[PDB]
Amino acid sequence: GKAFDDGAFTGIREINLSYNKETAIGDFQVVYDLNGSPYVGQNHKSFITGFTPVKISLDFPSEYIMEVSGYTGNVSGYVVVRSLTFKTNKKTYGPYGVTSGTPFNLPIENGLIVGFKGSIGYWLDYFSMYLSL
Amino acid sequence: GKAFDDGAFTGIREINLSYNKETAIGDFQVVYDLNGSPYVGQNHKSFITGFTPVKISLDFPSEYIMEVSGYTGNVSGYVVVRSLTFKTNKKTYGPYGVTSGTPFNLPIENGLIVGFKGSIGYWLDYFSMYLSL
Amino acid sequence: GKAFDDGAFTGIREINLSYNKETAIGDFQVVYDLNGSPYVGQNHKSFITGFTPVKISLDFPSEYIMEVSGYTGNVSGYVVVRSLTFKTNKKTYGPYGVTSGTPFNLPIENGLIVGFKGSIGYWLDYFSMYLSL
């Protein structure tokens, strides 16, 4: 796939991703908060189209993500991120995608996710998260 | 004067300020780095004319500010920032302005200046800096 | 179980734990670094015995943990941490305990694990980690 790295900002205002119920996660884009104003992140798009888009609009600054979880698994011979769930201090968003394979989960007791990086080919290949106070 | 707050970023690429050799610092503007791209901050302008402009172009990322020093003092009765000097790991820029009044200095042993806030009227009234690893 | 919270430090020098393949992780104790000096953390002990002891002596500061992974599952009806594996930039320690149950993993791309907290009864019930630059 094509690697991407948004870098770090001051928070998260909205996540716009797409997925397919039979395959895995596709596009990924974030509207970050940057010093109290929205900052529109680059849209990282799949090499293909035909996905179902989802918009996760958070009640920033009082609402924030407390746990990111999901599943990684094989799809057409390669490991990809098959499903994602975002849990905030107020609501749960997901699961989006296919909940099968190997689970992973990143619960946060103190601190915030302030950025994403990773790689997307046909599907989201892998991803990492920037954490800060 | 009029208050401003640029916020916090990834680093500093350039500082564009103006000064008067008989009064104090006037205009102040900064081009920061935001995850690899230049972020052109807004120009904070003095209410009057007659200043001399200077462009401090840093060789980012290998060149970075290690100490900010200067003088604050009375001009027309009220306190303002009369002079500024910027010392990097490669050279010194300034002093700009008038070196009279009460000195001050902020040396950095570890860390970086990543943002500026303050207020500007006829002259720079005051300012603060954001620090980060 | 009895809760514990060692707090945050400058780094990690050694980890002492015990485990039983038939069941789960038992004792857990850490020797941290506190500004250059070994800090002997309190030994958090299981209420029972019969465990196999393990000592992980890291070549601090050259060697540090880059990923912590394991499995959580049921034992006598209680959900506990059944297995743990510690990977550094030099070697891999583990797994200690059978690798069955629900997996979890925390790879670290930038940063350091600087503290542990959790709860231990007959077995390690749950745990969290402090992260810092």
Binding site: Y78, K117, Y126, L131 | - | -
Partner: peptide, 15 residues
């Protein structure tokens, strides 16, 4: 040190 600010990063999860 470099002139670039840094942050803790956890991951990757996936391929």
């Amino acid at each position: 040190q470099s002139g670039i600010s840094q942050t803790v990063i956890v991951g990757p999860w996936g391929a």
